[model samples]
Target chain A: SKPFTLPILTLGELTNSRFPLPIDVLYTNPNESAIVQCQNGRCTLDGELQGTTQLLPTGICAFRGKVTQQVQDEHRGTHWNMTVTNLNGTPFDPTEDVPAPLGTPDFSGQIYGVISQRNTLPANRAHEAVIATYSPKFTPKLGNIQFSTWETQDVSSGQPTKFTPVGLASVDANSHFDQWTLPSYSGALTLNMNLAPSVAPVFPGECLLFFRSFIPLKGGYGNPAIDCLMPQEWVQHLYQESAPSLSDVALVRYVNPETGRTLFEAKLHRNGFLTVARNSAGPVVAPTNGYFRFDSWVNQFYTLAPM
Target chain B: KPFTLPILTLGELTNSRFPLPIDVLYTNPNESAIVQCQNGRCTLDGELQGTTQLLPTGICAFRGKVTQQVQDEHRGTHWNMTVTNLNGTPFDPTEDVPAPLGTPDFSGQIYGVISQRNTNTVPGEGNLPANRAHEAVIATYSPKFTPKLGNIQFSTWETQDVSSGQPTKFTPVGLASVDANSHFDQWTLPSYSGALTLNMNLAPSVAPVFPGECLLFFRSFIPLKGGYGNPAIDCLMPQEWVQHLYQESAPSLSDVALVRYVNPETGRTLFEAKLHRNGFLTVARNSAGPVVAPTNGYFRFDSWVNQFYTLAPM
Candidate 1:
């Protein structure tokens, strides 16, 4: 596969000022542009004291820069490292609160830039920088987290509130190109996500996962083991009846929705496939005789991995 | 001390939710605008009308264009060049820009304009008259580590280098970076009412120059009004047929030239043309979302409506 370049945003272009948006935020990057006080509506260009080029709109934000990456991460090296930036750029007030909002999805208030593993698990490499509209519900709990309580509006009353101590649970939001915004609870976030090594079977044979339907790939790239979607009963049954007590069973992935960062990798193997075929569980039927049935409910991508 | 151009519209482009129309105004009574004409009749003098404004690239693909020519053992320095304005103002054999302005316009001295582009913008781009162009070297494509396509590098000229203002600097690195593939291009700049041929070559400063490697040259030049405040004759585009065209008929990351015409006043690009690249020569267009556009600027494109337009004096 060919290495490609993806557009990335920088702190300077984002705030267009020496500081980050929402005021008083800091960012870290090696290849970043110089930070200056561009607080003016029309900042001066280099060498010119008065005359200028273009101005960013008031109350607006943007990003600039490019990141080049290899097709695969075999180096185990960090691609991008980001800290104290937004994971969600939307406008939010950290001081605001609603009733029973606990675990209802609040932001880290502070943003993050990190890579994720196959299961939406945190890893290395920066995805994109973001700034959330609201603060999170749990910064103090994370020993490595950095936060400061500000004297601002209190949702409990119109009184001048002090100390935004409550931690906001993480929330997922989407950007222009379906870019999912993830939180950065840990102070410094580094992303270098790569799949893990194939290990022993974590689940029993034919372990029924939250899978929707059987899949059929075009010419290649089909899942190595499981072909049809099975229920938990048959899946677990095959696990018990598997040869050598289920060593060859493999976990398959089902990453749902055309635009989603969340992953749900299902587990299955050849022994389980033959087991389900041998005993018809709830009328085993091949889809449309095409070996793949019509299922609009499942549309988009997936990848195989070891669980 | 001077004036600016179409770029004046951008004070609003980067900041506003709704960008404004490009304010095109006519300046200088003596220096006239170079505009496309109707039935060979240009707009009346001293008035700002739609009839006289052009696409900014005065005669690309229409009457004006640059082609390719190479030689095997040709370690030549620069192409022998000849240039002129439609008004019969010859602008070659660059005059050092030290003299004062002539009265009643039409300086006995050549009032020529030079520009450079279709590049990476670290070196940025520039389009200026001898008076201003002589002041500094503009950003242009220049070779560096690899020949695949070098990064944008700037050329600088000290005051003592030219003493008086002169033609922009050109280096060996520059000549090597350009492809000049107007050859693979079946494209021939079609015959138009405004047909004008140009060739501005680079000076061979050092020994052993390579092909397309030393002459930081221009195939054309624009004529100015000769005095202060008069804009150069930059006719954006004219209504012509791009019909018998298929860019794949000649393909490349670009096979043809990607000429970005600079708006001298702003030291910024007015517009860029992908000659022989867009299946035909066109400034470019984004067609979608219920409408089409260059988005930031307006178009004089008579796509379906065939009207023969040319850069006649206004």
Candidate 2:
């Protein structure tokens, strides 16, 4: 007998590097409890803040195998404006540090799966891991709007949970989602304000940005690595209500600096926040007012302005 | 009106008093130092001769507390004596040999004394009372507590709730409007899951040569009727199981004592812990352990790390 399987949706690297600000090279200092400053072009990571432990698929397995990628690209500059001279406090020793010289990476690739877009999905399978896929630098055939309508169920007392899929597309400078346009492109199309946080340690008054981009992987099977998008290409735009009041939780959509537009939007109540993920196992969409995520040259303002 | 009997040597004494104070000297199991009395002079008692007939002293030096027992047995009544030995010599109480005065107290009064009636047969209460001290416990409340506002309630409900639904009922649920919100506008504080903690701060006005030598102690409490700003246990404890303040106060010099309860008396102990408060040396024995013991004078709840909210103290 054939077993029924639920389609697992997945997303690819968005053109928006969520962080739109110039990143200050961070190095954990030794001997002190706080992080240390880079000195003599060298710095060692503090014992506690050693290598980054990416947030893994959250459901049943929280901090387990959260995949992250470190790719290089001279184009589409990154969030960090200042140059980093060391790794773990010590100068990056090619002979001993990096086993291989980093190569230029292209992230804009197509990804496909049975779960492209669905109403309700398996509870434990969202953004499990950022399953890096392979995308071509050149644009291929434009895909059509494919979706299905969904109904509801009461999963509150542990029953079949129901979900709905909502789509928003636009042709204007701002994503006026009212004009529902499926997958059509002539000029640049964006999902602005739908990407990353404008700042770190976001203050109460600070506005956070969020967004998502979808690319189809060639031949499927799943390519599992993070890459950069081609230098000259189109990305999505996202946006939402601006400068939301404290009484209401706000989830603002992020934008792509390259396109000056929004990609997605969200709202946070007094005590409300949201989560984002990939393949039910990537970065969970748990964002505090200070937390923001997006794909671009790591931490660059081209992603958007401070909230 | 009163005549005194002359003391006798081992040779002159009779065995009629049988296993008497003389017997106690025999039962001691050690020896003593030499000293001179009235007409006769005596030598140190641990003689090489293993004679069971004569009484010996000084084989074990006293260390711990001194003890005296009042027997209520059916047999003839008589008091027995036992002294703690730190070195290796036992104490001896005999007619011919009297012990010198022992250690002095902070008031310079003699702390230890020798028993004369065990040999003289006095008719009243024994000349010396027990030297052990009784312990005390005290609790004190402070005027501080505040609540913190702002806590998240709804953002990721769909994602977190999705995977939890399954089996049997086949209808899918819609998050369109799932009546979910907190009743309170701001959280007074979050629910914590751990025991309360206490620390000792020496108070001034207490003048002791040794700062850490005082027998300090405390009793934790939670007044049955306390508000956010009244004198309560520790500051900003929380709101659980009661109207307010649980595990809020610390035991004071008056309330420090060995307690009879563990429901709020687990980490209590008896030791010498001292601190300097205000500039004077103060002993804080009970304030150094866990707040397992609770009372009507302090907050009686536990607190967990990183789980807190704040508001002005009322």
Candidate 3:
């Protein structure tokens, strides 16, 4: 997968407009992989201090791009939060450069969970696209669960099948389920969980936040769609005990059996760890431990505090 | 109400792998409605204008026109059909249609939903004296992993034993179509002159996932929950079969362990044991042995309750 370009929607809009503290916002900055930022007006990237302010869900605001360089706040714990302002060394907004949404965004719901997108896989492998169906904005009604992937082989053989989720969905907040499904596949599926480890690409599994995002559309500010419940990169809560602790399996490694050339490879672990596999691995492995850099494409890992 | 249903998809059947609950969810409770989950991808025999809230919940329920492709409510299209939903998984009913209950598991309750005779309800024709009791069923568990989604299970007494003054027998039966509500706790299933209250409680020991209706084959006769007015004798899972079938953990490693008369090594099956017959459960498989399949004549057992339980796909 090529590096993802950033979107115009601020971190606030993509999440929810309003938010709770100790939040971990999972987003991919342009030309980079995914990163987790815990915010409260000013942000904290592994303990850096800054002039960052909370970006309200609506209206125009200044940019809060990735922190280009970090300076230490305390001698023991360095605290500097200096983010790059423009693409060039000089200053200019890069809003129009990326692919823009067909229309302006309005009404939105506050969704919890990170965004995951995968574009490559082998041709012979059988899979079921899974969209985790539990979220804060909406808890899927008991039994309203569906999957793009599930079959006898998955259930009976206890084989770990592939279930790559593509996007999230939502209905109303009064009562609805905010979850994701594979827009790539058709028909809501009847599935089982032997296919657990395959979804390691999106850690804190089961963050499917379903809501309606379609055409003849509507957009609103101060809306939950634009606001958020918290800035968080979560882990599996409901089926945490149920989903088997599967061994490490490569989710993006595609090799040409005949040609002997690597079709694509992982630059990130399925749990979001940086690729120790090798450099030039096209697709980024989804990570779990809050923050990770595309290293060797070299990087250091962050340790989560027991909060 | 825009003709809506909370059913997302059949998330793996619970009992008969070929058929199980058409997993549905609802925010509002209702009195009555009727429809069927088609055997294939999309389209109903006549209705297609309702809401789909499915595979991806934004589309409509109707996809194409009615065709012979469905071949009469058959969902035994996937390989899992020959299996049971013992471990909370589903088989696609639209792929490869098989004989009804074509692949027999180790157990199946007797006098279950006899689809061929749906319109005919036996009203005390033979030795079965009428108790004036209604046929019913209660959802003992939701599909595994989804908690608080359904009304869970019990009963007994009345009619006397022919010789002794003991209570007569209570036969429990269930069908996938009648056990459709995976969200609520109880269901007075559409019955033949009888509707049933089927429970989906799996036997103890098996990891819980979704509950299966008509699992007397896989479950022991016990309720799943309890409260006042009615005791939630709702039997918690894992007691009988857990110690028997699951103790060995057969289905976990070899799914075929639950089905009888099959070559465990090659995965080739000889016969399926049906659960809808009268009198007794036939127990012999077409295996290479003089060990005979058991018959009703072998046990000569009777029940102590004038109990009974189903309803309509139309």
Candidate 4:
């Protein structure tokens, strides 16, 4: 079977705070087909192969000369507005592995949907950024995953204005594409993910991963600016036992954010979890009843890691 | 009316940390002389009484000049004070040296005036003011007796931010850090014997002072002949004397002067500052002040009783 070739949407040189923009397919060749959309901060294909939608950048925009003005507007309790650039979606690849569990069949050629943020002003730069990728895993076999599709909205127009899906435009013609390669950012982005085991055993599942950033200039931006505390990705498996296995054994690791070194790793097995310091490969210890309880107060900063 | 001499008494030698009293008497060829001792020690406050003139004597003996001193002699395990006026010698009065009353039987036994505990018994807890960094108590302690374990209950308070000449706040007391002992189990006694003084920095655990002079008081207790007794000893002193203790720094900024008061009507915090045992409250400009005196009225805070004085100033 040819692995599903997922659609890629690239955000270029983003300078806006109103984020997790909802990008969805606006039209479909067959009217019955579901369209891919960025719904509720993640992408959802909804088991559809073809459709078109408009991606709205409906958040605070800090376009060059207007950033200070926007900040002042925010100070004055006015709505911070956004700037919209033209977006044209295209088929980057025909045969590529859909993100995990559904079928991470052959890990072959990877397609790029590189969305970048630019720092044009010395004072108005993003402190952090994330490029979240979401693909909801919908399996017809288990009836577990629900069917939901994306709605289209035009970012180029004002709020409440809708855009019609006019089909694909010229490839690689985004207005701010050139600024993506510029060395403008003070620091690069690092990815952190918690890939836990599934509650169900399912195959060929799709999950969404969201990238979030806090711009230093935009003081109010946070982890996920649009959806607070909501998980970035949505995917599911058929059953607990049938879920895709990333490894033969279970593991829990705390990584050093700066050094990328594994500070501590716990090997988890059925009814047991054992952890060691200095990243030692040791035997697994008996686990708790689903909780690891340790107190840092009594020990009181005397140890390396609070236990 | 004559100022009545306070009675001095002692308990069993086995009483470990409690302070016992000592009395002083001098005999001349013609008559006998009597001296009043504060705690167990006597200080001569130069005064003429009878034929033998009373001078300012500090601690156990006269500061200067010695007469035939009759010392306490322990007969076997029993003890008694003897008057041998002829045996006295003369020493300098300005030296203000402490004389021996009689040593307690045990070597490790601690002695000091028992301090009255704050009405807020739970030091850091209760109506007392506590901060993230510190907790404070304002109580009178006596050096009249040396601080000893049994005489005073175990308690702790911290001294923080001394460089500014004021403590940031009275922080949680440090544990004794000794083997087999917790901070709550023992009192951190002062090493000195006179009245407790302030403006002193420490280790081996020293208590805080009000202005830098005189003995800073903590809640202390004295051991009576039977067991521990709560006497209405004046743990407080004159405010004018206290004001002189901190001549270099303002008493209001120092943790030495923190007290908590609430609005009588709403029961909200009204002010927190140095409240003298005297009627005046010393307040810091930056610290909380009365936004509004209680619309209902004010309850003047009395530190000695640790209560509100509802009546008008006498």
Candidate 5:
């Protein structure tokens, strides 16, 4: 099936100097404020700074941004009446992960502006001057073989983390479109459909594989701050036996086009799910399937293939 | 420059006692003699009945049983020390300093004298006027919280643009994404298993916006921190929505907001009278925990509590 594509909305150059703009995340509520760095035991809020909004009940961390003030209409323009309140607390530290130590900002940054547009994922389009533009390609191929087989069956060892029915079966690689090049801007869209059998099923009759891709970027990477909490690798570890196999799997790599540095990577599955990964070693990623789950446990890794 | 003290001759240590009352005037191990010029300051202020005359400075005043002393083998001596009262109230006085001139006088009497200065320090929570003083003062004052509720208009915001997941009233994609239902439309009966209204919209003012979206956008604002132990109020969207979310958990009749209030400080729901007869206004927040086991949706409330409530409705 043809993958769903939305406008490839791009975020302009974001810096830590902007303040007051809010960022959105799928995991938590939209209104609560999260703590960012109050590093020196104090926070300076004039320019942009990274921070997190509140995450009550289950205090999870989410989205990052750079906030700027621009004059415009009341609702559409800058929220000029906005007064950024300085709170007392420790800002977020990238070095820490889940179950952060008490007294540190789990995350921080104003959710400045948000607009979702339906962007076309132009195939074979060379890198352009955009923060999150689609890199068109004339050829889409079996990017790489993610082949794995059942090696053993500790089946009777039936434990929670282990697979069921301990046996290996051939999976139809076509369902995942393992090999094929994307046609140029004007060409018939082809849908790849392959079915693979489960060797080690998590649920019943399930098979899953970790998928990853690399692209270059203008700069080597922004900074350790921008890469905070961003996943370094892409993974798809969940494929239930009874669940419908995802069809539209699109892998996007954000490159700087200048430095040829990979800024981010995002692999979107047909089930309307995505795993966006980024780091200096990786590239930036914007999802065509705007609506999807990006499991950090799977896509948080930033390993890149040196081109 | 004041007149000087008269030069004194040496005196004999008439007697010594290891343990004696401070007022005893007899030889005391913890007492000392100090002097000033003729009109200069001296330890003694006035003459008293039966009080011994202070020997002049430079004189070897008799002292056999004294505990401490500023030795002045040559001349001139000054002393200073700070004192604290262990009792809750200030009462004791340093009577040994120097006897005053008047007898039965308010300025020199051991009890009820005007020579004392009192300063008290105690920690209090509320803001108290600086001008008010004296006597134990206790009162409660209203607290002010910044980022007040009215300033935070619950305007529509954005969520992850996704397909099968829960919808949060945000703009959705074309046919690619369809909102199945509004997550907030809920109703509470006497109990959860007992006559519950699911997907029913009551209280039009609290109706979920973008009815097509899957997730519900209810009214919840950040409550301010009043002084410790003071009740904070929470205005509900449709009392029934909160009631049902709780009913699904403990199936208790008390889960309904008919009589309970939600904690504004902590998001926990409390079972206490919060509504006025008109129903929208609150008198107090609930203090008790709920009675039933909540649904998985409530347990997975991270998406609702942190991200949802931390922000204003807008």
Candidate 6:
């Protein structure tokens, strides 16, 4: 009688960019290769194996293959609640903590996952670097990103720690997020990454997530990369008094601590003197008190005085 | 007929300390040198030097030789008295007239002498003292002395004192009307923040001098017109009296000393005394009657020149 076959769990369609999906299978012995091919929906990798890895319908398997090809696979990656720890389990703060730059994958994003065998091309590279992501579900969309890895101490104690930049990269879409390289002091880091965003994705109190993707890469299968994911948070304009008004003229400047260089200067003016209705989007009244305010994030200039 | 029977004596009166009086015969002379005085030294060819003394009733006797020079430029010869002294008699008009004689005794006596001597007489002879030589007008009612009928008599014999063989002189010493008003009634005094000030124009041009140096003379009463009047009962001195003298040199001898008669024991000086530069000989008393002669019988120059007498007899 034939051995009983285990049930197969099929996954979403796995498409290759310019090549076919390479498949490898393994079992208890060399004689089990014929019976252990990873296809359709199931994976059986109990056998000792080596070389390029493949994404099975159920899981990933490692085996030797010749035809190096790029593959595009779809994944219904289940969302998990994630928080960033400063190597000491201190969570990342979206407001209090500086987020990775929008529109770029700044490794500084709170999103992190332990480096694992499936998430890297070489299995030995596991647990070597942190996986950081920059993903927002609203207004600003997360796009092409770059990174500079830094060795840092945990800022959990409210003590400022050093962030020494070690490596830099602009992640190519082909390599995905697999490009996050670890520095020599890999025990801890502050991953500084550039995360570009789309204006449409920005909403108050809404947050983005970073996940480790076990998707097929261009040269291999089941290569791990940083993925920006959409997640939901219940939020509200929790506490707002009133918007401030333009009061008096004052010059404000920020300086770079290292170089002692003036980063920028502006005349900032605001007044909380009165509550007046203002159309935030239209032409605004110039500050009567000769005050100029700078919006650092948008690099925009405005006044609290409203028409 | 009986005029020929007038008695004549050849012997000079020798009972009085003064020399017997002498008679002079003028012969329409070009000049005459006469020496007749009492109570002080009289040198005739350098003979006598001593103070004169007096009798109660006014009587003076003197003996002196007279020299005459003929007119027509008689190639005149000068004559001098080598030694001739006279002790003049005392003149007491107050005692002679007595009280209730219509006017106070001696009321117009000094005024008469001063008026006649100072008015028509030569300035050289105008300073004759109203009393006998060295016999000062020593005593009187203090503060004020009023006539019996508020009027004075001017009889020639009634007012004369022939103590020195010549009538003594007097002058109106000071203003008599009370409470002389300032020209401008409204005056301002300085605040003590700065040194006190006496406004230059505050006192009228007619205002009396402080009357006597260092004397506390102030307008006791003031006449009012509109809002103007006495700002205070007594005006405050611009500067302290004691401090002002120390800052400046003693005033010149010609400058009369403003004095306040103080009690010798108490040293309270006030109400003003015009102590003349030479004792009280002719000192103008502003607020009251003149100070009496010094009891020491000497008008010492030391206290008078300094104008700092501790006790000035009132």
lDDT of each: 0.19, 0.17, 0.19, 0.19, 0.17, 0.19
Which portions of model 3 miss their true places by more than 4 Å? A1-252, A256-261, A268-307, B1-314
Best by DockQ: 1
Model 6 quality (TM-score): 0.13
Where in model 4 is the C-alpha error above 4 Å? A1-307, B1-72, B75-221, B225-260, B263-265, B268-314
Q: List per-model TM-scores for chain B.
A: 0.18, 0.13, 0.16, 0.20, 0.13, 0.18
**RMSD over all Cα atoms, model 4:** 35.3
TM-score of each: 0.17, 0.14, 0.20, 0.15, 0.18, 0.13
Per-residue lDDT of B135 in model 1: 14
Superposition TM-score, candidate 2 onto the true structure: 0.14
lDDT tens readout by residue for model 4, B145-216: 222211111111322211111111110111112122111122232233335443121112121123321221
Error (Å) of candidate 3 at residue B248 is 19
Order of candidates by TM-score, top first? 3, 5, 1, 4, 2, 6
Worst 10 residues of 4 chain A by lDDT: A105-114
How accurate locally is residue B54 in candidate 3, as Cα lDDT from 0 to 100? 14
- Model 4 TM-score? 0.15
lDDT tens digits, residue span B1-314, model 5: 11111111001011010000011011111112111111111111111111112111101011111112222222222111111111111212323311111101000001000001112222351221111100000000001100011000011111211111111111100011111221111121111011222211111222111212111111221111111111111122122222122213322222112232233345554322222111121222122222221111121111111112121211
lDDT of 6 by residue, B150-264 (tens): 1111112122222222222221111111122221211222111112322121111112233332222222121111121222222211111111122232444443444343333
lDDT of 2 at A127: 14
What is the alpha-carbon lDDT of model 3 when measured against the actual structure? 0.19
Poorest 10 consecutive residues by lDDT, candidate 5 chain B: B105-114
Higher-scoring candidate on TM-score, 3 or 5 = 3
Candidate 2 local lDDT, A1-307, one digit each (tens) = 2211111101221121211111111111112232111110010111011111110000000011111122232222111111111211122233322211111011211211111111121222111011111211111111111111111211122111111111111112222111112111111352211111111212332232223222111111211222111100011011111122333223334343345455443332222222211112223232112212222211111222322
The worst-scoring run of ten residues by lDDT in candidate 1 chain A lies at: A44-53
iRMSD (1 decimal) for each model: 27.2, 44.6, 26.3, 38.5, 40.9, 76.4
> Residue A164 of model 1: what lDDT?
13
DockQ, per model, reads: 0.02, 0.00, 0.01, 0.01, 0.01, 0.00
